[PDB]
RNA sequence: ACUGUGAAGCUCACACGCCAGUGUGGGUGGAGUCGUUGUUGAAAUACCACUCUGAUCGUAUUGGGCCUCUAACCUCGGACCGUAUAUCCGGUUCAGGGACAGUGCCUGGUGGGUAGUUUAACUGGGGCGGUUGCCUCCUAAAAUGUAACGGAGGCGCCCAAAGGUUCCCUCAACCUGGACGGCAAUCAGGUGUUGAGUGUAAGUGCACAAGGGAGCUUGACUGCGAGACGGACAUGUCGAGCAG
RNA sequence: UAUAUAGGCGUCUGGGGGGAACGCGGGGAAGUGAAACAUCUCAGUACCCGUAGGAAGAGAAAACAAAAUGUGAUUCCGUGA
RNA sequence: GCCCGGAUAGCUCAGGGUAGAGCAGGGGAUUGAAAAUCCCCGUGUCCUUGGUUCGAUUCCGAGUCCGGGCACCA
């Protein structure tokens, strides 16, 4: 299917510049930035409900924004991908950061 | 500088109240100490910056 | 996850390849690999999304490097004309260079070629040498202060305890007895009133301990401060006590 | 040299130079002061160039002001200081 | 203050699952002795601390001693 995969613009090599999150949104998971500065979550795909996971996706995004490193330089959220199992593209717009369910 | 100048900031309000000197070879860690904080009005833990 | 808009199995080609085999497309034929697979830090080469390392394709933007062409611009190359006199000047035309060079604005480099200036004081004359601020002692003439290139030294730090508080203790030296052990290590008994020690020079002090040991701890605070010391001035120093 | 132009003839009308001070537009020092000196001052002074007039320059808001229904072109004096 | 580079045996110097190479030093061998050559050794906190990783000389951070160019109006 699909998931929530974001590319945080942070340098994972630096010890200080490490992003770790933990959020809960029913509508306690653990998120760790890869060694190549990527973040992946668990979500559905395009062929699913509309507002069921919209609240779930919004809560997780706020966790990443609140956990942004202080020393991060440049754009923080560069890309978010919701591409299906066989479908290409389907990239979520990174500009949406408040009141997703609308 | 062996003995550099350090500033102690309150844990709660984060105000910088005191400045002193410590040996950074004998005490490699950030100095932790309880000092009076005028803003909070009471003795609070202070930490090096 | 897959297959008849046709799997494997063989064979046809290509690229990588430690030719061990991988990946791509083609054909015959049609009914497959796949989950804990057993070792493993990591399990599936079931598959998917993002991505790293190199390698390669395309469209968009984007910068540099050259070769050309002549029409800008250049020629103290030639020939005519103004012009009777003209190695000036200008114009016409041929021959060459040619978006280079020259010039304007902006910008980095070299720059005694030139210009404006600096290059201390003390001092038994000046130079050479030495010194310049702070702390301690003597000279210093028993209050305070007192000069000389007079006599001796030290400082431009250190300590998170070597600061605060409560409680406890008494050294150095000598004598006597003890396995290595001796003048001197650790043990034991006696005499021992300061001769030891006080982070660091000297002086004044400290055995009542300011010296030795231990438990807790951050007052190495905030707002203030009667009254004084010292002083050309600017500096410097002590302080009971009130509240949090 | 063709269009023509540069140029050449003829004729009218102006210009040139001087002046003590004042005006406008440009170029622009140093001694000196800082108890030295380079930023700074001296000073846009001294001097130099171009120009006028009886005076010159400026002048009729693409202005001040601050919620007041406030002034209302320019120039020059006194305060503001 | 900014940007790069160097530190690895006694000496010089190459290097995510390697500590190595050439000279030195010790014994063995060749030679009639001697020299010149071949064999086998000993030699190492990979500047020092920490981090990522199953695993670091190798990647990252800080610090130490050098070197080069530039910036520096209490
Ligand atoms: Zn506080």
Swiss-Prot record, chain A:
Recorded superkingdom: Bacteria
Assigned keywords, A-Z: Repressor, Ribonucleoprotein, Ribosomal protein, RNA-binding, rRNA-binding, Translation regulation, tRNA-binding
Single GO MF annotation: tRNA binding
GO cellular component terms, semicolon-separated: large ribosomal subunit
Gene Ontology annotations of biological process type: regulation of translation; translation
Self-association and partners: Part of the 50S ribosomal subunit.
Family, similarity comment: Belongs to the universal ribosomal protein uL1 family.
Job of this protein: Binds directly to 23S rRNA. The L1 stalk is quite mobile in the ribosome, and is involved in E site tRNA release.
Protein name: Large ribosomal subunit protein uL1
From Swiss-Prot, chain B:
Position of the signal peptide: none
InterPro entries: Ribosomal_bL33, Ribosomal_bL33_CS, Ribosomal_bL33_sf, Ribosomal_zn-bd
Similarity comment: family membership: Belongs to the bacterial ribosomal protein bL33 family.
Domain of life assignment: Bacteria
PROSITE patterns per UniProt: RIBOSOMAL_L33
Protein name as annotated: Large ribosomal subunit protein bL33A
Keyword Cell membrane in record: no
UniProt KW Signal keyword: no
Biological source species: Mycolicibacterium smegmatis (strain ATCC 700084 / mc(2)155) (Mycobacterium smegmatis)
GO CC annotation, single: cytoplasm
């Amino acid at each position: 299917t699909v998931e929530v995969a974001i590319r945080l613009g942070v340098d994972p090599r630096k010890a200080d510049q490490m992003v770790r999150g933990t959020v809960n949104l029913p509508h306690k998971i653990n998120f760790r930035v890869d060694k190549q500065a990527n973040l992946h979550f668990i979500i559905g795909k395009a062929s699913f409900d509309e507002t069921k996971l919209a609240e779930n996706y919004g809560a997780a995004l706020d966790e990443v924004l609140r956990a942004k490193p202080s020393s991060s330089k440049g754009r923080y959220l560069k890309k978010v991908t919701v591409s299906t199992t066989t479908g290409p593209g389907i990239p979520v717009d990174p500009s949406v950061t408040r009141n997703f369910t609308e | 500088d062996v003995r550099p100048k350090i500033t102690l900031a309150c844990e709660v309000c984060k105000h910088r109240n005191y400045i002193t000197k410590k040996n950074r070879r004998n005490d490699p860690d950030r100095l932790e100490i309880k000092k009076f904080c005028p803003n909070c009005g009471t003795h609070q833990p202070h930490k090096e910056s």
